[PDB]
Design a protein around this nucleic acid. Structure first.
Lengths: 48, 79, 182, 136, 49
RNA sequence: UUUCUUGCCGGAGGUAGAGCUACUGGAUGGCCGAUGGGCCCCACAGGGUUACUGACGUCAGCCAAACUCCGAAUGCCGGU
RNA sequence: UUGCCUCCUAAAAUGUAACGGAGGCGCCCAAAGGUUCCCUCAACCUGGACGGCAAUCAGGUGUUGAGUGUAAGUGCACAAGGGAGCUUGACUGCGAGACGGACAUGUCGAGCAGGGACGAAAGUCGGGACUAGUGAUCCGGCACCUCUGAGUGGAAGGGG
RNA sequence: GUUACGGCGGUCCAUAGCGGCAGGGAAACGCCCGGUCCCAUCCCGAACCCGGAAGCUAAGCCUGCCAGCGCCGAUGAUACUACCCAUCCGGGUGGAAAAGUAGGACACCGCCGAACAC
């Protein structure tokens, strides 16, 4: 893994709208994102 | 009404100069060729213009390696 | 220690589920997803080469590592292409980053897709790999929709050790990919 | 007529009229055939004449195969020109025919009509030629 | 022209040691390159005259 | 006798001959089967329908000087 | 048309003519030279919004195909082809031996100085995949030299 | 001395390849897990390094068998041909070509390391 040519990559936590948490690394430096639908609440996954 | 042809380069007098079994001196030209029709074998070098020459004294031999014809020099026993 | 969500799920449950479904003579046949390749082919770079920089930045922000800029191995006059013109960007994800990108792509992006009704599970390679294309690039939180430039039909593909369409679909369903079952 | 769609070299040396034919010496398509007995540059015009003669003799039924193809260009220099100043332009299209080569083949129910049609063709041809048959 | 017969001279011995072709369009500036000055007996930088 | 003749031995060739599904340019058949035009079922989904223009491919068959998967005889170069 | 290079003619060594059949030329490359290391698709499927006869792409085999500074013989997944680093084999300056081809032309082993790569590992690799990309001599320049200097204490006035 | 165990090297480099069927892990050849350690990605620990045996012969590896594809391939004959004979034809002496069937072949040896019994 190269030293600095590789862009930063920090672990982050996200919370969906239905209230499901999620932890994963993403380019977002803030570390706290707010996702709306997510796959735990999307209609396609849930049913119908 | 004439011909667009009529040109031709000098014959380059290529080919094998020392054939199998001929005793040659070191540095002797063995094959004048374009490309490696024959490849440099043992005690045989390849010139800039693809001229195969003997690197050591001996007798010219023609062999085959990996399906490629090669020119080798077999050392000649001292008398 | 640390372990991605999807990677841990695969190491703990998915292998057993796939073994039970497609009983293999040996454990080593258990399909295991391999490098995930995400690409943006510009095509119009011949008219606006600047789009390559935006594609590079977007791919970096989406994946986590720099995108390799891929030139053209051919020069077809029909599309104004010459040998060496940067014509796309490619990112190969392997290991922890691969699994984390898969986890994010399944848990964040695809649900955020506009009018998302899933993709038919017929785009599999026929040898175990699955390729599809995202209709935009704003679904990823790293690509903030407020500061986007244009739409880039984003090619994605996942390479697996599967042997064919059946094992590939079994693996991806186990990983939890949306599928427009048909 | 029979003319090649193209030839890699349009000014070729004359085909060597030597030896008997090594290939195409038997009826491989039809029931009867015309076997050459002498060397000749059979031209596309001669081929056309022979095949038209065969077809017009057999009238309605029957099938004709033309084994030889005139793809060899024989050149001719302009009339009343001295020797030299290059090679002439392609003038004739010929098939190098050697003895033993089967030039035409015919399938026709009536043996007499088939032989008469092949005889027509032979008379159109510039060489000695016999009517051979598949039955050996 | 186009590819003039430029003359590479050393910086130290200042001897016009070599002559070689160079495409003036691709390399308009004087061709500075490491070469062997026999007067100096060693490799020295040579540049176009 | 280094010359030459003969025998034998070592040698590189691409000619004559052919062979071409071995390359680069060709040849009667039908074939899973390309644009399929055409009947259309009447889907703009999707599909047989191909009388005829007939893709690749395939079947014995054929040619080349600037073709060669091959390949002599002689000739030539050496040694004896 | 005239010189040079390539092919066929050319009759399997070499060479071989014609106002014979075809073409090229006579440049170009400082990174297309050197070295060190590494590679890897020619076409069907699934597809891959747009993006079909094409993309960024992913797999399989096509078994050495395929394609590859400029026409024949070569070079391949033993890469002369495709990428990368070096910092300038851009290997240059003094070069026994041999040689191939009337002069002209052409080949290189190898020894020495200085370096370039590769270094651990070896000690190894003399412009370009190779043949065209040129013009004798005369006469003049231009830089350097431990040469000459028309009596010279000496220089100015020619040569290498 | 032996093994379906290993590497290293072997031929005018396919009689050796491709494909199909069956078999193996004590030690080797592999497979494989996370980046504290050299090193690397024109991005990616995929190629190269670190600690390994919790686990595996699926693949590579190699073993046996299939002549299906490829490969090799006679003898004979012919083509061709050197010389010679021959008025136009042709013939003699010598040499002598691919396909196929007859056929061959699913390759052919040494160095050293492991266990076995001595």
């Amino acid at each position: 893994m190269k030293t600095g040519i590789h862009p930063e990559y920090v672990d982050t936590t996200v919370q969906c709208g239905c209230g499901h948490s999620f932890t994963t690394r993403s380019t977002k430096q803030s570390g706290t994102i707010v996702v709306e639908v997510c796959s735990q609440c999307h209609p396609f996954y849930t049913g119908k | 009404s004439s011909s667009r042809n009529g040109r031709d380069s000098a014959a380059q007098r290529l080919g094998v100069k020392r054939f199998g079994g001929q005793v040659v001196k070191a540095g002797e030209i063995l094959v004048r060729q374009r490309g490696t029709h024959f490849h440099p074998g043992v005690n045989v070098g390849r010139g800039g213009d693809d001229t195969l020459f003997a690197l050591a004294p001996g007798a010219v031999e023609f062999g085959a390696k990996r399906g490629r014809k090669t020119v080798n020099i077999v050392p000649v026993a001292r008398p | 220690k640390a372990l991605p969500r999807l990677k841990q799920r695969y190491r703990e449950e998915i292998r057993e589920a796939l073994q039970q479904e497609f009983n293999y003579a040996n454990v080593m046949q258990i399909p295991g997803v391999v490098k995930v390749v995400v690409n943006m082919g510009v095509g119009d770079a011949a008219r606006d080469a600047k789009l390559i920089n935006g594609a590079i930045n977007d791919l970096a922000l989406i994946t986590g590592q720099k995108p390799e800029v891929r030139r053209a191995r051919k020069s077809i006059a029909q599309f104004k292409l010459r040998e060496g013109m940067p014509i796309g960007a490619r990112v190969t994800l392997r290991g922890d980053r691969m699994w984390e990108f898969l986890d994010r792509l399944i848990s964040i992006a695809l649900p955020r897709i506009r009018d998302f009704r899933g993709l038919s599970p017929k785009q599999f390679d026929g040898t175990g790999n699955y390729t599809f294309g995202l209709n935009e690039q704003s679904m990823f939180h790293e690509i903030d929709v407020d500061s986007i430039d244009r739409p880039r039909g984003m090619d994605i593909t996942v390479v697996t050790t599967a042997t064919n369409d059946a094992e590939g679909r079994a693996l991806l369903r186990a990983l939890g990919f949306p599928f427009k079952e048909n | 007529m029979l003319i090649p769609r193209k030839v890699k070299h349009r000014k070729q040396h004359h085909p060597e009229q030597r030896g008997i034919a090594s290939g195409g010496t038997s009826v491989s398509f039809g029931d009867y055939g015309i076997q050459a007995l002498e060397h000749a540059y059979i031209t596309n015009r001669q081929i056309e004449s022979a095949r038209i003669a065969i077809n017009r003799h057999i009238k309605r039924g029957g099938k004709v195969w033309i084994n030889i193809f005139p793809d060899r260009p024989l050149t001719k220099k302009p009339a009343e020109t001295r020797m030299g100043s290059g090679k002439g332009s392609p003038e004739w299209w010929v098939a190098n025919v050697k003895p033993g080569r089967v030039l035409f083949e015919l399938s026709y129910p009536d043996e007499k009509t088939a032989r008469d049609a092949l005889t027509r063709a032979i008379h159109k041809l510039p060489i000695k030629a016999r009517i051979v048959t598949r039955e050996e | 022209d186009v590819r003039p017969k430029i003359t590479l001279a050393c910086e130290v011995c200042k001897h016009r040691n070599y002559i070689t072709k160079k495409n003036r369009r691709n390399d308009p500036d004087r061709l500075e390159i490491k070469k062997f000055c026999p007067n100096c007996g060693t490799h020295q930088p040579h540049k176009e005259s």
